[PDB]
Design an enzyme around this catalytic site. Structure first.
Site, PDB file in Angstrom:
ATOM      1  CG  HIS B  42      -0.570   0.615   2.406  1.00 59.41           C
ATOM      2  ND1 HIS B  42      -0.167  -0.123   3.497  1.00 59.41           N
ATOM      3  CD2 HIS B  42      -0.483   1.914   2.777  1.00 59.41           C
ATOM      4  CE1 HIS B  42       0.143   0.694   4.485  1.00 59.41           C
ATOM      5  NE2 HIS B  42      -0.032   1.936   4.069  1.00 59.41           N
ATOM      6  CG  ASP B  88      -0.115  -3.617   3.071  1.00 59.08           C
ATOM      7  OD1 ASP B  88       0.345  -3.206   1.989  1.00 59.08           O
ATOM      8  OD2 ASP B  88      -0.302  -2.775   4.000  1.00 59.08           O
ATOM      9  CB  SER B 185       2.595   2.218   6.437  1.00 62.29           C
ATOM     10  OG  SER B 185       1.531   2.620   7.274  1.00 62.29           O
ATOM     11  N   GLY B 186       4.891  -0.072   6.142  1.00 66.19           N
ATOM     12  CA  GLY B 186       5.971  -0.750   5.462  1.00 66.19           C
ATOM     13  C   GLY B 186       7.210  -1.036   6.311  1.00 66.19           C
TER      14      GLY B 186
HETATM   15  C1  LIG Z   1      -9.301  -2.781   5.391  1.00 68.40           C
HETATM   16  N1  LIG Z   1      -8.805  -1.410   5.576  1.00 68.40           N
HETATM   17  C2  LIG Z   1      -7.334  -1.237   5.296  1.00 68.40           C
HETATM   18  C3  LIG Z   1      -6.864   0.241   5.395  1.00 68.40           C
HETATM   19  C4  LIG Z   1      -7.459   0.975   6.595  1.00 68.40           C
HETATM   20  N2  LIG Z   1      -6.996   2.154   7.115  1.00 68.40           N
HETATM   21  C5  LIG Z   1      -7.770   2.492   8.173  1.00 68.40           C
HETATM   22  C6  LIG Z   1      -7.654   3.724   9.066  1.00 68.40           C
HETATM   23  O1  LIG Z   1      -8.466   3.814  10.006  1.00 68.40           O
HETATM   24  N3  LIG Z   1      -6.719   4.681   8.834  1.00 68.40           N
HETATM   25  C7  LIG Z   1      -6.483   5.742   9.869  1.00 68.40           C
HETATM   26  C8  LIG Z   1      -5.114   5.486  10.514  1.00 68.40           C
HETATM   27  N4  LIG Z   1      -4.102   5.377   9.442  1.00 68.40           N
HETATM   28  S1  LIG Z   1      -2.495   5.853   9.762  1.00 68.40           S
HETATM   29  O2  LIG Z   1      -2.421   6.832  11.007  1.00 68.40           O
HETATM   30  O3  LIG Z   1      -1.905   6.343   8.370  1.00 68.40           O
HETATM   31  C9  LIG Z   1      -1.763   4.319  10.222  1.00 68.40           C
HETATM   32  C10 LIG Z   1      -1.033   3.608   9.272  1.00 68.40           C
HETATM   33  C11 LIG Z   1      -0.471   2.378   9.648  1.00 68.40           C
HETATM   34  C12 LIG Z   1      -0.649   1.870  10.950  1.00 68.40           C
HETATM   35  C13 LIG Z   1      -0.095   0.643  11.327  1.00 68.40           C
HETATM   36  C14 LIG Z   1      -0.278   0.142  12.621  1.00 68.40           C
HETATM   37 CL1  LIG Z   1       0.458  -1.421  13.005  1.00 68.40          CL
HETATM   38  C15 LIG Z   1      -1.022   0.871  13.569  1.00 68.40           C
HETATM   39  C16 LIG Z   1      -1.600   2.097  13.218  1.00 68.40           C
HETATM   40  C17 LIG Z   1      -1.445   2.609  11.926  1.00 68.40           C
HETATM   41  C18 LIG Z   1      -1.985   3.842  11.531  1.00 68.40           C
HETATM   42  C19 LIG Z   1      -4.302   4.316   8.424  1.00 68.40           C
HETATM   43  C20 LIG Z   1      -5.674   4.544   7.733  1.00 68.40           C
HETATM   44  C21 LIG Z   1      -5.588   5.739   6.725  1.00 68.40           C
HETATM   45  N5  LIG Z   1      -6.593   6.583   6.621  1.00 68.40           N
HETATM   46  O4  LIG Z   1      -4.612   5.969   6.002  1.00 68.40           O
HETATM   47  S2  LIG Z   1      -9.049   1.422   8.557  1.00 68.40           S
HETATM   48  C22 LIG Z   1      -8.549   0.454   7.245  1.00 68.40           C
HETATM   49  C23 LIG Z   1      -9.268  -0.846   6.885  1.00 68.40           C
END
Ligand SMILES: CN1CCc2nc(C(=O)N3CCN(S(=O)(=O)c4ccc5cc(Cl)ccc5c4)C[C@@H]3C(N)=O)sc2C1
Ligand SMILES: [Ca+2]
Ligand SMILES: [Ca+2]
Lengths: 52, 233
Positions: B42, B88, B185-186
């Site tokens: 991603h 992913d 991420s990654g």
């Molecule tokens: C199936 N979907 C896959 C992608 C996804 N993103 C979701 C989400 O709630 N988001 C808010 C937090 N974020 S973040 O702050 O960029 C992020 C990214 C990676 C992370 C990895 C971990 Cl292990 C924990 C928290 C994380 C938060 C990811 C994503 C977004 N809008 O980009 S829910 C969801 C569900």
């Protein structure tokens, strides 16, 4: 208990063959003479925090 | 990273950072060998052109150990789905080999059965990155690490408003406010075993960052070890 008893005394990978433990090592390590310890082949082996 | 500590000198040497044309970090990666970086599929959508920085701990300063590497091949898992983030995982082959040194070294790839049985049943793994220090914060200018409990797969599924596939696992805390976050991420999730650190996950997604009742979701590396092998030719 073999690989379940304290990793079979292996430094790294533990496999049960027949009814005994066989140990092995990630790429960049060789198995020592005792068949358990993993010894780095060259500098900067994988998985080791660096000290110089 | 939310909570946790700075990686101190030498402590997170397999950390890589995908940098955009603006020279700004948008995602992490893990050093696997002189030529290969593991990251999240991603992440490939966060920028059209990017490079890999290794050896960095403080983006504000030149420590001398830093190295920028051009990407030669992007190997995306073909089954990757943006809608669920299933599969992913991507591997990057670098144009020029990484020279291992202080703060630059690969994490070990484990064998599947041993890792699932021995690594992933440990109390904790370690996640690290330059990502946000809270849900709505700015990215960190310091490389950080964080010890994260393995979370029981059934609690994780109960926790989650979205599907947790066989290619994902959960780690982190129920209410305690420590988690990976945006820009991690990654990045590496590694498990220490007798002072040797093995790749066990890739930072994938979460519902926010460190939200109460929510966990960090990670790509289950041990489901892709033959795939990673093939990718590294
Ligand atoms: C199936 N979907 C896959 C992608 C996804 N993103 C979701 C989400 O709630 N988001 C808010 C937090 N974020 S973040 O702050 O960029 C992020 C990214 C990676 C992370 C990895 C971990 Cl292990 C924990 C928290 C994380 C938060 C990811 C994503 C977004 N809008 O980009 S829910 C969801 C569900
Ligand atoms: Ca720096
Ligand atoms: Ca939580």
């Amino acid at each position: 208990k073999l690989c379940s008893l304290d990793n079979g005394d292996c430094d790294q990978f533990c496999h049960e063959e027949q009814n005994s433990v066989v140990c092995s090592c990630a790429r960049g390590y060789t198995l020592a003479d005792n068949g358990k310890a993993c010894i780095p082949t060259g500098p900067y082996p994988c998985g080791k925090q660096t000290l110089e | 990273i939310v909570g946790g500590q700075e990686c101190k000198d030498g402590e997170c040497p397999w950390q890589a950072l995908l940098i955009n044309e603006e020279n700004e970090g948008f995602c992490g990666g893990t050093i696997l060998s002189e030529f290969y970086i593991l990251t999240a599929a991603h992440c490939l959508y966060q920028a059209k052109r990017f490079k890999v920085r290794v050896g960095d701990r403080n983006t504000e300063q030149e420590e001398g150990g830093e190295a920028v590497h051009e990407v030669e091949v992007v190997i995306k898992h073909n089954r990757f789905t943006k809608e669920t983030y299933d599969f992913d995982i991507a591997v990057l082959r670098l144009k020029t080999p990484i020279t291992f040194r202080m703060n630059v070294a690969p994490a070990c790839l484990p064998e599947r059965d041993w890792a699932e049985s021995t690594l992933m049943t440990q109390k904790t793994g370690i996640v690290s990155g330059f990502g946000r220090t809270h849900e709505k914060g700015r990215q960190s200018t310091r490389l950080k690490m964080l010890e994260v409990p393995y979370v029981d797969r059934n609690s994780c599924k109960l926790s989650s408003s979205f599907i947790i596939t066989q290619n994902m696992f959960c780690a982190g805390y129920d209410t305690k406010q420590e988690d990976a976050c945006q820009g991690d991420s990654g990045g590496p999730h590694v498990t220490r075993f007798k002072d040797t650190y093995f790749v066990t996950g890739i930072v994938s997604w979460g519902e926010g960052c460190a939200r109460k009742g929510k966990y960090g979701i990670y790509t289950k590396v041990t489901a892709f070890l033959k795939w990673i092998d093939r990718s590294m030719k």
